[PDB]
Amino acid sequence: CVFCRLPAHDLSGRLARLCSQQKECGASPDFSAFALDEVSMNKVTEKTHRVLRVMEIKEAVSSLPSYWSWLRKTKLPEYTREALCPPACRGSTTLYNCSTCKGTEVSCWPRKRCF
Ligand SMILES: *[C@@H]1O[C@H](CO[C@@H]2O[C@@H](C)[C@@H](O)[C@@H](O)[C@@H]2O)[C@@H](O[C@@H]2O[C@H](CO)[C@@H](O[C@@H]3O[C@H](CO)[C@@H](O)[C@H](O)[C@@H]3O)[C@H](O)[C@H]2NC(C)=O)[C@H](O)[C@H]1NC(C)=O
C-alpha cells in the first residue's frame, strides 16, 4: 500500500540502496488483498518512510520482513476499518487498490460492524 502515494519519498530506491549495503532483501511484498482510502494510504506511506529512515541511519534491514508482516496482519486491517467507519466515512469513500493504485467508490460500513 506504500507505493501509490507520496512518490517523492522514493521508498523503492531507498530500499534498493539500503540493500546495496549483509543478508538478502525481499522488496516488495504483495499487498493486492488491500485497498485503502486516501488518508490511510498517506498515513501508511509516511509511517513506512519513517521506519525506513531509522533503518537507513543504522544500515540495518533485518527487521524489514517483520514490518511487512505486521502491515499485512495487523496494521492494514486497522486502516481498512478506519476508512469505512465514522468519523472518517460518510455515505461512501474511494478505496485505492494497494497493488494497482486504482480507485473504487464503496459505501461506508454500518455502525453495527464498526462498533
Ligand atoms: C486489486 O486489483 C487486483 C488486480 O486485478 C484486477 O482485476 C480487475 C479488477 C481489473 O479491473 C484490473 O484492474 C486488475 O487486473 C485484484 O486481483 C485479482 O483478483 C481477482 C480476484 O477477485 C483475480 O481474478 C480472478 O479471476 C479468475 C477466476 O475467475 C482467476 O484469475 C482467479 O480465480 C481470480 O478469481 C485475479 O487473478 C487477481 N489478479 C491478481 C493479479 O492478483 C485484487 O483483488 C484487488 N484488490 C482489492 C483489495 O480490490
Per-residue DSSP letter, 7: G
- Residue ranges of domains in the chain: 7-19+27-114
Reported resolution, Å: 1.5
Task: Report the atom number in ligand 1 closest to the C-alpha of 104.
Answer: 49
Q: Would you call 49 exposed, middle or buried from its count of C-beta atoms within 10 A (0-12, 13-18, 19+)?
A: middle
From the CB of 35, is ligand 1 less than 6 Å away?
Answer: yes
- Contact between 92 and 107 (Cβ < 8 Å): yes
Ligand 1 in reach of 31 Cβ (< 6 A):
no
Q: How far apart are CA 96 and CA 99, in angstroms?
A: 9
Ligand 1: centre distance to CA 50 (Å):
31
In the numeric block, the cell 539500503 is attached to: 18
Q: Which residues contact 62 (CB under 8 A, 6 or more apart)?
A: 23
47 Cβ contact partners less than 8 Å away, ≥ 6 residues apart: none
Which cell numbers hold the place of 62? 533485518
